[PDB]
């Protein structure tokens, strides 16, 4: 089968300007496992990025977390660019501070 | 070979009753809790309609008394990765709906070799009415009742699956695993004419099938 990835963008801690924090792009429920994910600062690719092990849920759909250590400000925009087989166009999901 | 068949309808399978709506399986998951018919993992479909058959009359293309044929080699009915029934004849009906979506209904005449029961999310078709010449479609209820359906060893059953395929029409047998779709128009076709209310006991239903 083939399934599209559900993408969530959220921070480890509530966002305060100036303090160090973590940014998470949780991609879940996709199949097959082949997936390409980037974290973006102002539309540019962040190179310091770590991702957890690729696992799967009870329906055999893969989930995996991309995270980076970042310092939020009110002029910096963050987003997650995800590309998959079920996507002829890669999706970019902007980061809302409170979600 | 093409075999024409006369299926003698038995008693409705619970929770179906004589003068009530016909309940059919709707959901296709969890995979081990639903009845699957097909060749392999990439070629199968999940049943919706189930109907007990008490007598099968076999005829050829030339309408002559034929003897019960061997099961079609490869086709099988499985529950949780275990074969529970042999398929003896099958037929697939394709009818256009929206010029880019077709209703494809697969009908299988099976004999259960090992009794089993499932607990599925059932539903029934329905059509509302309005005081206008406006088109009213047939849809599934979109609500489901979780209840047990039982199949007995040595009995014969008529199993159906109905899916909506988008794109160009397919040539040859279309294998597709898909639940019945909410808020989606359906038309009663050659394969689901008996799934509105149960056929009368001992009445006969006709098919032209391949083996």
């Amino acid at each position: 089968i083939q399934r599209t990835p559900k993408i969530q963008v959220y921070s480890r801690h509530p966002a305060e300007n100036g303090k160090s924090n973590f940014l998470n792009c949780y991609v879940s429920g996709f199949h097959p496992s082949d997936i390409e994910v980037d974290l973006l600062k102002n539309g540019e690719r962040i190179e310091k990025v770590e991702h957890s092990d690729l696992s799967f849920s009870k329906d055999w759909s893969f989930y995996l977390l991309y995270y980076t250590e970042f310092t939020p400000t009110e002029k910096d925009e963050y987003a997650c660019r995800v590309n998959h087989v079920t996507l002829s166009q890669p999706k970019i999901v902007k980061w809302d501070r409170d979600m | 070979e093409t075999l024409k068949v006369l299926l003698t309808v038995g008693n409705p399978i619970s929770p179906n009753e004589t003068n009530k709506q016909t309940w059919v399986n709707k959901t296709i998951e969890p995979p081990g809790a639903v009845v699957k018919i097909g060749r392999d993992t990439q070629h199968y479909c999940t049943m919706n309609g189930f109907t007990l058959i008490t007598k099968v009359d076999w005829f050829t293309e030339e309408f002559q008394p034929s003897e019960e044929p061997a099961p079609v080699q490869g086709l099988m009915v499985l529950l949780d990765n275990h074969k529970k029934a042999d398929v003896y004849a099958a037929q697939q009906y394709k009818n256009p709906i929206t010029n880019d979506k077709q209703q494809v209904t697969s009908v299988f005449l099976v004999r259960v070799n090992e009794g089993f029961q499932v607990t599925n999310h059932l539903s029934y078709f329905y059509r509302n009415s309005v005081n206008t010449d406006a088109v009213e479609n047939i849809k599934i209820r979109s609500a489901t009742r979780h209840t047990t359906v039982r199949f007995n060893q040595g009995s014969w059953y008529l199993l159906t699956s109905t899916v909506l395929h988008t794109g160009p029409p397919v040539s040859g047998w279309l294998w597709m695993n898909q639940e019945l779709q909410n808020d989606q128009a359906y038309i009663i076709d050659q394969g689901i004419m008996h799934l509105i209310t149960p056929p009368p006991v001992s009445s006969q239903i006709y098919f032209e099938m391949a083996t």
Binding site: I1, Q2, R3, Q8, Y10, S11, R12, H13, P14, F22, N24, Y26, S28, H31, P32, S33, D34, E50, S52, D53, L54, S55, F56, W60, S61, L65, Y67, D96, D98, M99 | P31, G32, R39, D40, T41, Q42, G74, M76, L78, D80, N81, H82, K83
Partner: protein, 232 residues
């Protein structure tokens, strides 16, 4: 709770990407990692801090699983791509409840029957792979020992998880169309609040966020003594 292993193999991995990787779990926490590139069973999270026989035994076991998972692709007639997934583990009943299921290209097609000590399935793909694994030396024998003795005993030993972490709460009003309650860094993942979603954090905690189309928010978590209200 549970001790589960997520097995995954792919016929055509991406460049610099393992063709077979494993993740070991004790409930919601991952303790073990493995992949074909490294070939080593490695600790995760707080489990990194202490013996060697246990991890050495796991590394050899996961290498055998790697050989069989790749062997499954050969058992099927060669036509890619392929994806073999396996779910092996158990739980400590009042006793034990084993789990052994496999999926081919996302389709559940096989298990490990405990009565007949082999891999069960009547699909044409499950008859070839279960054959090939059976045709390997003592492969089925070890699986029955793991699902019924090794996994339950290993869970009993570890129970001789309890760490709690209350969720930081925030409630904000976004520009609703003309005319969001989130919890950060909580553990255990069990938590209740509309259209909530749920996800993990890199540190092992969890994060949830539910927003209702419009008032206070209520949160109940194992780290909180009593449910706590939330204010704007």
């Amino acid at each position: 709770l549970s001790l589960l292993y997520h097995l995954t193999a792919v016929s055509s991995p991406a460049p610099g990407t393992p063709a077979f990787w494993v993740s070991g779990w004790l409930g919601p926490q991952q303790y073990l990692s493995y992949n074909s590139l490294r070939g080593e069973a490695e600790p995760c999270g707080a489990w990194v801090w202490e013996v060697s026989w246990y991890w050495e035994k796991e590394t050899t076991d996961l290498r055998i699983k790697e050989k069989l998972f790749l062997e499954a692709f050969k058992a099927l007639g060669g036509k890619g791509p392929y994806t073999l997934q396996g779910l092996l583990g158990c739980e400590l009943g009042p006793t034990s409840v084993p789990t052994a299921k496999f999926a081919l290209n996302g389709e559940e097609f096989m298990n490990f029957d405990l009565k007949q000590g082999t891999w069960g399935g009547d699909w044409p793909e499950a008859l070839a792979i279960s054959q090939r694994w059976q045709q390997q030396d003592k492969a089925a024998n070890k699986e029955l020992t793991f699902l019924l003795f090794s996994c339950p005993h290993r869970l009993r030993e570890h129970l001789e998880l309890e760490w709690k972490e209350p969720p930081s709460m925030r409630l904000k009003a976004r520009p609703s169309s003309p005319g969001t309650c989130s919890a950060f860094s909580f553990y255990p993942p069990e938590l209740q609040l509309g259209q909530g979603d749920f996800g993990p954090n890199s540190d092992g905690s969890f994060h949830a966020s539910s927003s209702l189309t419009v008032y206070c928010c209520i949160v109940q978590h194992a780290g909180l003594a009593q449910p706590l209200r939330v204010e704007l």
